[PDB]
Design a protein around this ligand. Structure first.
Ligand code: ZN
Ligand code: ZN
Length: 218
């Protein structure tokens, strides 16, 4: 099983990539980010496991950084698997109240901090959490970095195919995807969960795949 990967994307922005093996899929990988605000560090999604989340934390803590908060883009374990351990560490965890509501239903540990609004600033003018509408899941949120013009779209951004439809809203995804496009028309980079990095075109490609996957389902 490949090691938790950490790669500097640019100043103050790192992509963490963790790995899971699941029968009927082989070895799956998952991208999140760590975002620095000066010497404050923020986790955008957690690794699948407590153990990899710890490694991720330690890596930055040992380099001097203070883990100030974590935000999970949706309720599925590939974003939320580390929440429990981080809670036991008194490292502050966030999720929208819908994500938290869905985590509870799933029998999962909830984030300690939440918010009810479409938009929420985790750091004043530096980290914005935004809910486009239902897509991959009812609750999926994106994370925007205004200074850098980087959008982490989580599993909502699916330019090459929609992936797991298990909890999806095919009816709503096209609308949500358009809302996303209209909000962040000047994105320079778009980091997704299971696709390589790209520019703002990825948001259009998602709208397109949403519209396709929808038609297919009828
Ligand atoms: Zn998911
Ligand atoms: Zn995913």
């Amino acid at each position: 099983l490949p090691d938790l990967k950490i790669e500097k994307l640019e100043e103050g922005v790192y992509v963490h990539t963790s790995f899971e093996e699941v029968n009927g899929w082989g070895v799956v990988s998952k991208h999140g980010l760590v975002v620095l605000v000066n010497t404050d560090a923020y986790l955008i999604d957690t690794p699948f496991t407590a153990t990899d989340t710890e490694k991720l934390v330690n890596w930055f803590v040992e380099r001097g950084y203070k883990i100030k908060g974590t935000i999970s883009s949706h309720f599925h374990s590939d974003s939320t698997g580390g929440i429990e351990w981080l809670n036991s560490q008194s490292i502050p965890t966030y999720a929208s109240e819908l994500t938290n509501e869905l985590l509870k239903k799933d029998g999962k540990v909830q984030a300690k901090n939440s918010f009810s609004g479409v938009s929420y600033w985790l750091v004043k003018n530096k980290i914005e959490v935004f809910y486009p509408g239902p897509g991959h899941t009812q609750d999926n949120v994106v994370v925007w970095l205004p200074e850098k013009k980087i959008l982490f779209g989580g599993c909502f951004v699916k330019p090459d195919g929609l992936g797991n439809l298990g909890d999806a809203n095919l009816e709503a995804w096209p609308k949500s995807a358009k809302i996303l496009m209209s909000k962040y028309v000047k994105a320079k980079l778009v980091v997704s969960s299971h696709s390589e990095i790209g520019d703002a075109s990825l948001l259009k490609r998602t709208w397109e795949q949403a519209v396709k996957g929808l038609n297919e389902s009828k």
